[PDB]
Design a protein around this ligand. Structure first.
Ligand SMILES: Cc1ncc(COP(=O)(O)O)c(C=O)c1O
Ligand SMILES: Cc1ncc(COP(=O)(O)O)c(C=O)c1O
Ligand SMILES: C=CC[S@@](=O)C[C@H](N)C(=O)O
Lengths: 390, 386
């Protein structure tokens, strides 16, 4: 090849309290939870080791440099520069959603999602005492589509007060077109519904199709949107706890910031600021190479399952390092299949059940690991399927 | 064995030191101007070498380190099962305010007390009620009749207890903590005992954690701890709730997850474990520097600014200074001090109670900074008399 500047071959050796790699049995292969088995960009590491040299970790403000980095990143990577004053630090995307659920809806209000969607959406809606309402994505011809009439009918319902929009959508791995994003933002604005656009997979569109950040919608609807971003999925920094809400409406923004502070997610920890700035200032080259690795892993995985496991169907996706795999032909509830698969092969993938929708027919597989592990997992999956047919 | 002489060089986004004018001396916000313990630094450096920061569990090595630390430092040992990770003490209070009380309910504090108690009570739409600490003869005391009368009020549903008490720097006696816990249990009031200053008792005394009170009251208590104040790790975001009642504990744990404060960041677990397993020697050295600084502060002011009084305190690195004899509202005295001398201390007003007669001074800094701050304090008063 042309030499890659960075290391996508060696799996980082985690400490014992890793969710992905802790308490596994011998030879078990975790490909479920969405973190990478790649080392992070050395540019980010350098900024973290630099910060540690302070050797005292008192209270931190959010510097202008943080929002500048966020804005520069969105401009360069997605050709949509937010205003830096739109940006508000939050310690995490899901905690920010949870705080905005409490701040911008009332107990008993309904909050719209499009099932199947990220399981943590349900937890922060239901656990906060709001009610999930879904305009289900319709599954036909191996693709999901939106029932736009049903979506609007639910948005227009008085008790439906917020839409948590997954953009790109996890677990189906779909980066919405500009038209779809602006249509949903316009729908929300029309019906006075707050659009929370979870854009945490936005840097991981594995094609050149870009995302459309919600904050780029025109100024009728722009006052009704919040874009949520983080370096965590892009750069393998789940535990960094750095995120950013982009809220063009200044009063909404100040209220969300107040809700972040009140909840305890408004203040950066000791690494969040320098590590996120380094990621958004200097992570471009590493991300470029990562997407080349991911496209290689996906090309292999999709080709393998096409030729070798016709019992399953990998859905066409263009975003995320996660594959959404239809296992319906196995006649087995995804939760039962994933248990069986783990017991027989050691491969641990995500049952689709927790994403609701039709997720009980699907598994989600994380391909953000060295190709050796992709090959291992794909072969284990075939071994699991073959063991059923016998 | 450790460096308590040289102030760490912060990056620019520091709350205590960022954006100061030339030669300004901040002694207000409670973070130290000391290097952290090298044993903690070692664990952070090695964790960064993982070079990938995915999701982390709370290992029960964390709970074991917490239990061991409480036993060594306070002679009190919680059951590991009682322990729930939280990223911060104040956010845990805020979550428990939302989980365990209703909007409009009253939540009892003992003024003057930590300003952030008011922020999380009132910010969540609960109402602060205070049984004010009685201030007589330079000492604060509890009006036990008043306290119980308010705790017995039906709409008073929670007590946020500062143990040791910031800003006065008082580690309650065993009898005091038990009596408060008994009163809370008697009136079905949840006792949230903020013990974040619990490792900073400077006398030969020990705090009494709320979780040590006996089972006729232990079901009504929550102890909150963190290495933050002890080890100068405000930005680590590691803390722990100790909740003996398992029903409360399950509900508190869920409220932390929903708030976004239930999950450790990439350094919280190894750094806190290192602090609790290996920080005893550094803390022992810290306390002697703190006692030396308090002694200097008390002696200097007794000789030089006799119209002010450093309260006898047994806990924390925060001096609570009665300035009432200056005849000046504390907030105006602090603004005047900053403008005239560059010394930035904490006005007492924000702690409510009788806080307008007090300032709070952070002595967790090298002796040379204390000497400077005291000198500026005297100079400000001298200039007022001129
Ligand atoms: C759609 C979506 N939102 C949010 C998150 C995580 O957000 P955070 O950990 O910053 O709260 C993930 C995880 O990768 C995700 O897939
Ligand atoms: C009484 C008290 N509680 C809590 C805190 C800080 O809590 P948190 O861990 O939320 O920053 C402080 C600050 O040092 C404090 O003095
Ligand atoms: C004005 C001072 C802000 S502050 O120090 C809150 C603090 N951490 C404490 O211990 O009270």
């Amino acid at each position: 090849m042309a030499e890659k500047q960075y290391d996508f071959t060696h799996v980082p050796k985690r400490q014992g309290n890793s969710i992905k790699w802790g308490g596994l049995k011998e030879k078990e292969l975790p490909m479920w939870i969405a973190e990478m088995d790649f080392r992070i960009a050395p540019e980010i590491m350098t900024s973290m080791e630099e910060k540690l040299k302070v050797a005292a970790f008192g209270y931190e403000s959010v510097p202008a440099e943080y929002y500048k980095a966020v804005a520069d990143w969105e401009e360069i990577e997605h050709r949509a520069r937010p205003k830096e004053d739109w940006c508000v630090f939050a310690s995490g995307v899901v905690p920010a959603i949870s705080a905005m659920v409490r701040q911008f809806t009332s107990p008993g209000d309904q909050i719209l999602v499009q099932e199947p969607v990220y399981n943590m959406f349900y937890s922060v809606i239901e656990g906060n005492g709001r009610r999930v309402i879904s305009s289900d994505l319709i599954y036909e011809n191996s693709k999901y589509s939106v029932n736009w009439a049903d979506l609007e009918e639910k948005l227009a319902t008085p008790s439906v007060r917020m839409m948590v929009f997954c953009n790109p959508h996890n677990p189906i791995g779909y980066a919405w077109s500009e038209e779809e994003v602006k249509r949903i933002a316009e729908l929300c604005a029309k019906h006075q519904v707050l659009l929370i656009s979870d854009e945490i997979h936005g840097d991981l569109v594995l094609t050149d199709e870009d995302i459309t950040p919600a904050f780029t919608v025109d100024w009728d609807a722009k006052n009704w949107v919040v874009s949520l971003i983080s370096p965590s999925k892009t750069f393998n920094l789940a535990a960094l706890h750095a995120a950013c809400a982009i809220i063009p409406n200044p009063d909404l923004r100040a209220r969300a910031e107040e809700s972040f502070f009140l909840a305890g997610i408004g203040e950066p920890n000791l690494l969040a600021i320098p590590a996120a700035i380094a990621a958004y200032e200097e992570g471009h080259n590493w991300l470029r190479e990562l997407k080349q690795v991911l496209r290689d892993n996906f090309a292999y995985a999709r080709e393998f399952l096409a030729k070798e496991v016709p019992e399953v169907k990998v859905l066409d996706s263009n975003a995320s390092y996660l594959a959404w795999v239809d296992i319906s032909a196995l006649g087995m509830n995804a939760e039962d299949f994933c248990k069986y698969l783990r017991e027989k092969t050691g491969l641990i993938i995500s049952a689709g059940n927790g994403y609701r929708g039709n997720g009980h027919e699907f598994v989600r597989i994380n391909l953000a690991c060295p190709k050796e592990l992709v090959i291992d997992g794909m072969q284990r999956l075939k071994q699991g399927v073959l063991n059923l047919n016998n």
